[model samples]
Target: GSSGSSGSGGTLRIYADSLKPNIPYKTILLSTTDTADFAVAESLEKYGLEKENPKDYCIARVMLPPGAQHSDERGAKEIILDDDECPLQIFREWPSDKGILVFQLKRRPPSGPSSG
Candidate 1:
């Protein structure tokens, strides 16, 4: 994670490999409040998250804001949740439980990375 404002506050592309096939992708803003509606949110719970936002089948992708309130500095080129990890663990581990960042899920493309 980034520690200061020296790093650019910009978007980091996500790798779309390992994702399932033939599924629609949707994007949404993610937060710790559990107030949003997104598919990734529901999936997060299954991955061991203690909490989750409302159930949503519409959202397939999400954009975690860099400047999310009280968020941890995102200095790494990329940070993604493994198949075994949940959203809260990242927040707690990264210590970004109070902040927001862009996180997205997408169906596997034929090639290249996902520009989430």
Candidate 2:
């Protein structure tokens, strides 16, 4: 699970799982000024993330002052959970009144290890 600020200055939370085969598991959260809009955006972002959309990896939302439209959502780009070697990246965007974002990443057994 994860939480962060949005480009429109809102909070977000996320959860993900990897209970299937072949497919990589993912989760994402998006937030807007309006709570309703944030929920919709979060759902959309989550879907895109699950599909492993390229845009979802690069383009993230953020907020800036009057002239600036967005800011760089900087933080831990990837995370490795305890006891698991799999890499996980937690993305974030911010126009937030809050200071920092929160996040959590869970891990499960891999199908197999690379043999070479």
Candidate 3:
């Protein structure tokens, strides 16, 4: 009773630019795309992507390159995800060169109830 489709899938490995100021590496294995977003969010949190203190006066957001690009100076596009959005929708592939997935953080005005 251990049969389905082929047991192989596509995976993308790259660096995770987190809030901790350290370059961490992560690999994404192809599976249920729905769980991919949740797993990715959790991974970022575990990498120190957390809500800032009130005194800090700011928040954090995620950013990445839209297509295959070496750097993120100008290619870095701000990724604003919705409630039902998934990371897979944003990043389809890694950069051909350095494969540096930039995660530029943001500090916007405190407003509305954020993520629960």
Q: After superposition, how far is residue 86 of candidate 2 from its true place, in Å?
A: 33
Write down the worst ten-residue block by lDDT for model 3: 52-61
TM-score of 1: 0.25
- By lDDT, the best candidate is 3
Per-residue C-alpha lDDT of model 1 across residues 79-98, encoded as one tens digit per residue: 43333343432443443443
* Residue 94 lDDT in candidate 2: 30
- The C-alpha RMSD of each candidate to the native structure, in angstroms, is 15.0, 13.4, 7.9
Query: What residue runs in model 3 are displaced by over 4 Å at the alpha carbon?
Result: 1-6, 12-14, 30-32, 35-37, 45-72, 93-116
Better structure of 1 and 2 per TM-score? 1
| Local distance difference test scores for all models | 0.36, 0.33, 0.42
Candidate 2, poorest ten consecutive residues by summed lDDT: 82-91
TM-score for each model: 0.25, 0.19, 0.40
Across 1-116, the per-residue lDDT of candidate 3 in tens digits comes to 89645675444343444444475555545343543334445445555555433222222224444465554454554443343433443355534353444323233334554633
Ranked by TM-score from best down, the candidates are: 3, 1, 2
Query: What residue runs in model 1 are displaced by over 4 Å at the alpha carbon?
Result: 1-76, 96-100, 108-116
